[PDB]
Amino acid sequence: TVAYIAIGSNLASPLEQVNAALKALGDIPESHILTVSSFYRTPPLGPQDAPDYLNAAVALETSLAPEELLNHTQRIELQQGRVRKAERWGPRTLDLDIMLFGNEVINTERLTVPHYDMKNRGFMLWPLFEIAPELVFPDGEMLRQILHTRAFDKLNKW
Numbered sequence: 001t002v003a004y005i006a007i008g009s010n011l012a013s014p015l016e017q018v019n020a021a022l023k024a025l026g027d028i029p030e031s032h033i034l035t036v037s038s039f040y041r042t043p044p045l046g047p048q049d050a051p052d053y054l055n056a057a058v059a060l061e062t063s064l065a066p067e068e069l070l071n072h073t074q075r076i077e078l079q080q081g082r083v084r085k086a087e088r089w090g091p092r093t094l095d096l097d098i099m100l101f102g103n104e105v106i107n108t109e110r111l112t113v114p115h116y117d118m119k120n121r122g123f124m125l126w127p128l129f130e131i132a133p134e135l136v137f138p139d140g141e142m143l144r145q146i147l148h149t150r151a152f153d154k155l156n157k158w
C-alpha cells in the first residue's frame with residue numbers, strides 16, 4: 001500500500017525535527033519511503049505571533065494495516081515530536097497525519113482517511129501534488145481537480 005503522510009512542524013527552527021521525523025518514518029517496520037516532497041513554508045491560520053509551519057508530504061510503501069501505521073506515527077510524535085527547552089520539554093510541535101492509505105476509505109474511532117480536512121488545505125494538497133500529480137481519491141475525485149477548482153495559492157519553499 002502507498003500511504004501518503006503529511007508532516008507539519010511549527011518549531012521556530014524546524015529542519016532538525018523534520019529530518020529526525022523523516023528518518024524515523026524510514027525505520028517503520030514493513031515499510032519504506034518512496035519519495036519526499038520539498039519543504040514548504042506556510043503561515044499559521046491565525047495571529048501572526050506564531051512560527052511559520054514547515055509542511056511536507058511523504059509517500060510510504062507499507063504492508064502494515066492502517067491502524068498499525070497510525071500506532072507508529074503516533075509513537076514518532078511521542079518520541080521526537082517535542083523539543084527540549086532550557087528548563088523543560090516543550091509541547092508537541094510535530095504532526096504526522098495520514099492523508100491517504102492506498103485507495104482505502106477508513107472511518108473508525110481512531111482514523112478518518114482520506115484526512116477529514118485536506119481538501120481545504122493548500123499546505124496539504126500542494127506538497128502532495130508535487131509527488132503525486134495524477135493522484136485519484138477513493139471516491140474518484142482527482143487531486144488535480146481539487147487544486148484546479150479551489151485555486152489555492154502555490155506555497156513558498158522553505
Ligand SMILES: Nc1ncnc2c1ncn2[C@@H]1O[C@H](COP(=O)(O)CP(=O)(O)OP(=O)(O)O)[C@@H](O)[C@H]1O
Nearest residue numbers: 095096097098099109110111112113114115116117
Ligand atoms: N488520518 C489521520 N491521521 C492521523 N490522525 C488521525 C487521522 N484520522 C483521525 N486521527 C485522529 O486524530 C486524533 C487527533 O490527532 P491530532 O494530531 O491531535 C489532530 P491535528 O493533526 O493536530 O489536527 P488536524 O486533524 O486538524 O490536522 C488522533 O488521536 C487520531 O486518532
Ligand SMILES: Nc1nc2nccnc2c(=O)[nH]1
Nearest residue numbers: 008042043044045053055123
Ligand atoms: N500552515 C499550517 N497550519 C496548520 N494549522 C493547523 C494544523 N496543521 C497545520 C499545518 O500543517 N500547516
Ligand SMILES: [Cl-]
Nearest residue numbers: 105106107112
Ligand atoms: Cl462516512
Ligand SMILES: [Mg+2]
Nearest residue numbers: 008095096097
Ligand atoms: Mg494535522
Ligand SMILES: [Mg+2]
Nearest residue numbers: 095096097098
Ligand atoms: Mg495530527
